[PDB]
Ligand SMILES: *C(=O)[C@@H]1[C@H](NS(=O)(=O)O)CCN1C(=O)NCCCCNC
């Protein structure tokens with residue numbers, strides 16, 4: 504009954520959403536009562552007929568930011584930076600710029616004062632161009648006042664964390680962060696030998712899409728991983744105490760909230776909600792206006808532990824893929840939904856909510 508019921512529940516949540524959104528391939532991984540469960544649907548590639556499995560690599564887009572936050576948590580952990588450091592403390596090129604007056608915390612939580620969703624098209628993946636972009640940028644409003652969701656914001660936070668550790672961001676992730684977390688199917692740059700696992704992405708008229716190079720791509724949206732590895736990361740988040748202390752502390756640093764916007768409390772990478780909450784509210788928290796419009800923040804008097812009866816989550820996309828991760832610390836419950844189409848966030852949340860609701864029931 505239990506195995507049959509869980510399959511029944513996940514199939515029921517997933518299958519209509521896949522059909523309705525014309526999703527070629529979708530992987531689910533659920534952590535429940537200390538055990539992983541995988542459900543794989545459809546095709547990693549429509550053209551070669553490769554099936555989705557729990558080891559298929561998907562682009563997770565902005566979910567990468569939770570890994571970036573973990574690296575930053577490590578640098579914090581290790582007293583190499585503080586959240587109240589000025590950005591320009593960690594990059595001489597920024598001294599004399601507006602980043603003299605913006606904190607690492609502002610950058611991590613999108614309150615630096617109007618850094619946009621993405622780098623402009625004119626900024627290529629080039630150290631000098633990135634440097635020059637930040638040097639010339641001016642806040643639209645006072646740092647610390649408004650949240651505007653931004654790749655250049657948290658991207659810079661990740662880059663500066665790497666600088667504080669004295670190594671390239673990409674090298675730190677490959678050589679330190681991924682091994683510490685036990686992740687052998689998680690990549691910024693997929694090895695040639697593992698490319699057979701890399702799903703095709705699909706956009707309009709099913710054109711094939713895989714993510715290309717962009718400025719601060721590793722920090723903002725660089726990770727390709729499997730449902731099995733992403734669930735391993737969720738399990739590390741559910742039980743940081745199971746990791747060696749330096750990494751336990753790094754993960755804990757991503758479970759601290761600094762302010763609220765509506766129903767959402769903003770942490771490093773993770774965004775949190777009270778749990779239970781209605782599906783419509785959780786969808787609103789992950790809606791297009793949240794990503795695209797500035798919102799005045801409600802600052803907390805002290806950082807808040809994002810634990811107990813809460814749902815922590817992150818959406819992420821690339822042109823060809825759509826990812827969603829959600830976990831409930833107080834229930835030892837986590838889930839990962841990875842697809843090779845960029846389909847609406849509301850639909851991702853709908854699948855997850857149906858699974859979580861069914862598990863409670
Ligand atoms: C991350 O996935 C961000 C946005 N995150 S979300 O929470 O709003 O879903 C969605 C699109 N994002 C992203 O990184 N896109 C990748 C394309 C990079 C293009 N920059 C030139």
Ligand SMILES: [Cl-]
Nearest residue numbers: 621622654655
């Ligand atoms: Cl960007």
